[PDB]
C-alpha cells in the first residue's frame, strides 16, 4: 500500500502567489483612497495665517476690491478670509540653507 500511495509527484510546484494577495488585502488601501478628499495635491495648503495676512498683505489677485450683494445668499459674498489664496507655499529659504 505504501509504495503504491506514496509515489513521487513530478512537476508539482507549490502556490507561492495567493499568500501575496492575502497579505496585500490585509495591508489595506493607501491614504489617497481613504482620507484624501478632492484629489488634492501635496503642495496646496501650506500657508501660515501670519504669512498670508502680514507677509503678503492679503494679496490674492482674483478677488474684487469691493464686495457685492447677492440675491440668493443674502450676504456680501466675496469673503477675504474664506478664499485664502491656496497658492504658493510658504518659503523663506530654510530649504536652501539646509
Amino acid at each position: 500500500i505504501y509504495r503504491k500511495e506514496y509515489v513521487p509527484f513530478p512537476g508539482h510546484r507549490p502556490d507561492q502567489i495567493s499568500r501575496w494577495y492575502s497579505k496585500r488585502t490585509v495591508e489595506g488601501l493607501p491614504y489617497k483612497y481613504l482620507i484624501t478628499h478632492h484629489q488634492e495635491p501635496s503642495q496646496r495648503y501650506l500657508i501660515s495665517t501670519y504669512d498670508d495676512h502680514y507677509n503678503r498683505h492679503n494679496y490674492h489677485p482674483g478677488l474684487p476690491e469691493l464686495r457685492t450683494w447677492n440675491r440668493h445668499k443674502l450676504l456680501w459674498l466675496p469673503e477675504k478670509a474664506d478664499f485664502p489664496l491656496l497658492g504658493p507655499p510658504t518659503n523663506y529659504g530654510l530649504y536652501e540653507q539646509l
Binding site: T25, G28, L34, I35, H37, N91, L94
Partner: protein, 427 residues
C-alpha cells in the same frame, strides 16, 4: 522644539506605529529613503520633534519598537517606510508571551527591559527639551499589556515630571480573539492608572462600525483601522510642529481635561471621514466637521455618549479657518443639549486651531473627550473578570509564573472603585 519619544509595544502597537510614521513622513515630506522632498519650510522648522537629523540629510524617527516574537516585526521591516527606522531601535525576543500577562510582565517580559530602557535613555538624552513619551499597545494581549505596562512604570519612575501618553486598544465587548483577555485587561488597567497622564481608549469594533457605516467599505481590514487611529494620533501633536492662531501642546490638553488625577481616560475621534461616493459632493466647512465630530457613531471607543455626561471636552482644529464659527458652533452644541454636559463647571469645550491641515484635506479636526460613559467599558470587563476569577479558570497559567492570588483582587478592587468614582459625577 519640544521632542516626543515614541514607544511601540506588541503586534497592534507595532502595526499602528508603522502606519503612523508613514502619515507623519507624508505630512513632513520624507521619502522612504529618509530624505526630504517637500516644498515648504513649515515642514522643516519643527521636524526635530519626531525625527533626528542623521548624516547626509536623512531623518530617522525617534521611535523604539518592542516585541517578544519576531513574526510581525519582519512585516514592519517590510513596510513601505521600513528602512527609515534605526536597526538598533528594533528590540525583540525569541520566545513569545503566550497571551499571558504574568509571564510577559515577570518571566519573559522583564529580562528584555534592560536593553529597551538603555535604548530609551539613549534616544531621550540627545533631545534638547523632552516633553514626554508616547506609547501605543493593546491591553488584550501578553506583550503590549504585559511588557508595555512595566515599561510605563519604569519610565514614570525615571522621568516623573514628563507626560506619559497611551493609545490603548482595549478589548472589544462583542467580538474577541482571546479567552484570557479579561485577565490581561484587568491586570493592565490597574498599572495604567498609577503611571499615566493621558490615556486614549480605542475599541476595534467601534473602528469597524466607523468603517462600515461612514466610509462604506465592503472589506475593511486592519490597515484602515490603523490609518484612522494614526490620523487621530497625528491630530493631537499638530501644535507642536505647525503654527496656528491658538496653540495647544499635550500639556494644555491635560490641564484643560483632567480635573481629578484618576480621571484621565478619553475617547478620541476624527472629523472628516466620508465614503468615496459622497466625497465629491460634500463641502468642508466648520458646521460639517463639528456636526459629525460630536456624533455618537464617529467615536473610536465603543461607548455611547448619550448614556453618560461629558465632563470636559477638547477639539483641536487644523487648517486655515475662522475663529468665530469655531466658537459659535461649539457654544451651540453646548447650549442645545445641556443635559449631557455636567453643570458644576460652566464651560467644557477647549478650542485649539492650527493652520496646516493633513495632506489630502482642506481642514480636519481631532476630538478628545472625557465622559462618564467610559465606565461602561470597564463594568463589562469587571463583570467578565468576576465571572472568571470566582472559579479560578485559567489561573494556574498566572499563579505558577510568580504571581500571588491577591494581585487579581487588588486590581479588580482598584478598577471597581475607578468605576464607582465615575458614577458620582453623573447625577
Amino acid at each position: 522644539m519640544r521632542e516626543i519619544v515614541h514607544l511601540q509595544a506588541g503586534q497592534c502597537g507595532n502595526q499602528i506605529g508603522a502606519k503612523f510614521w508613514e502619515v507623519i513622513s507624508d505630512e513632513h515630506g520624507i521619502d522612504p529613503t529618509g530624505t526630504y522632498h517637500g516644498d515648504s519650510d513649515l515642514q522643516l522648522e519643527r521636524i526635530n520633534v519626531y525625527y533626528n537629523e542623521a548624516t547626509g540629510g536623512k531623518y530617522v524617527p525617534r521611535a523604539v519598537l518592542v516585541d517578544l516574537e519576531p513574526g510581525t516585526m519582519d512585516s514592519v521591516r517590510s513596510g513601505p517606510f521600513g528602512q527609515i527606522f534605526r536597526p538598533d531601535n528594533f528590540v525583540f525576543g525569541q520566545s513569545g508571551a503566550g497571551n499571558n500577562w504574568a509571564k510577559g510582565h515577570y518571566t519573559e517580559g522583564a529580562e528584555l527591559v534592560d536593553s529597551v530602557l538603555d535604548v530609551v535613555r539613549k534616544e531621550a538624552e540627545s533631545c534638547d527639551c523632552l516633553q514626554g513619551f508616547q506609547l501605543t499597545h493593546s491591553l488584550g494581549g501578553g506583550t503590549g499589556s504585559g511588557m508595555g505596562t512595566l515599561l510605563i512604570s519604569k519610565i514614570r519612575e525615571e522621568y516623573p515630571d514628563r507626560i506619559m501618553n497611551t493609545f490603548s486598544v482595549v478589548p472589544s465587548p462583542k467580538v474577541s480573539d482571546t479567552v484570557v483577555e479579561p485577565y490581561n485587561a484587568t491586570l493592565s488597567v490597574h498599572q495604567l492608572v498609577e503611571n499615566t497622564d493621558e490615556t486614549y481608549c480605542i475599541d476595534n469594533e467601534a473602528l469597524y462600525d466607523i468603517c462600515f457605516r461612514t466610509l462604506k467599505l465592503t472589506t475593511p481590514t486592519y490597515g484602515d483601522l490603523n490609518h484612522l487611529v494614526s490620523a487621530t494620533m497625528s491630530g493631537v501633536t499638530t501644535c507642536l510642529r505647525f503654527p496656528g492662531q491658538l496653540n495647544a501642546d499635550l500639556r494644555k490638553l491635560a490641564v484643560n481635561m483632567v480635573p481629578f488625577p484618576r480621571l484621565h481616560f478619553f475617547m478620541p475621534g476624527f472629523a472628516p471621514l466620508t465614503s468615496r461616493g459622497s466625497q465629491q459632493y460634500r463641502a468642508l466647512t466648520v458646521p460639517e466637521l463639528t456636526q459629525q465630530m460630536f456624533d455618537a457613531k464617529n467615536m473610536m471607543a465603543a461607548c455611547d455618549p448619550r448614556h453618560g455626561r461629558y465632563l470636559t471636552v477638547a477639539a483641536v482644529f487644523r487648517g486655515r479657518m475662522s475663529m468665530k464659527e469655531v466658537d459659535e458652533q461649539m457654544l451651540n452644541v453646548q447650549n442645545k443639549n445641556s443635559s449631557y454636559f455636567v453643570e458644576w463647571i460652566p464651560n467644557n469645550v477647549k478650542t485649539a486651531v492650527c493652520d496646516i491641515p493633513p495632506r489630502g484635506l482642506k481642514m480636519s479636526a481631532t476630538f478628545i473627550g472625557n465622559s462618564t460613559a467610559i465606565q461602561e467599558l470597564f463594568k463589562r470587563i469587571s463583570e467578565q473578570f468576576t465571572a472568571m476569577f470566582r472559579r479560578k479558570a485559567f489561573l494556574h497559567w498566572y499563579t505558577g509564573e510568580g504571581m500571588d492570588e491577591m494581585e487579581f483582587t487588588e486590581a479588580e478592587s482598584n478598577m471597581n472603585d475607578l468605576v464607582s468614582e465615575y458614577q458620582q459625577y453623573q447625577d
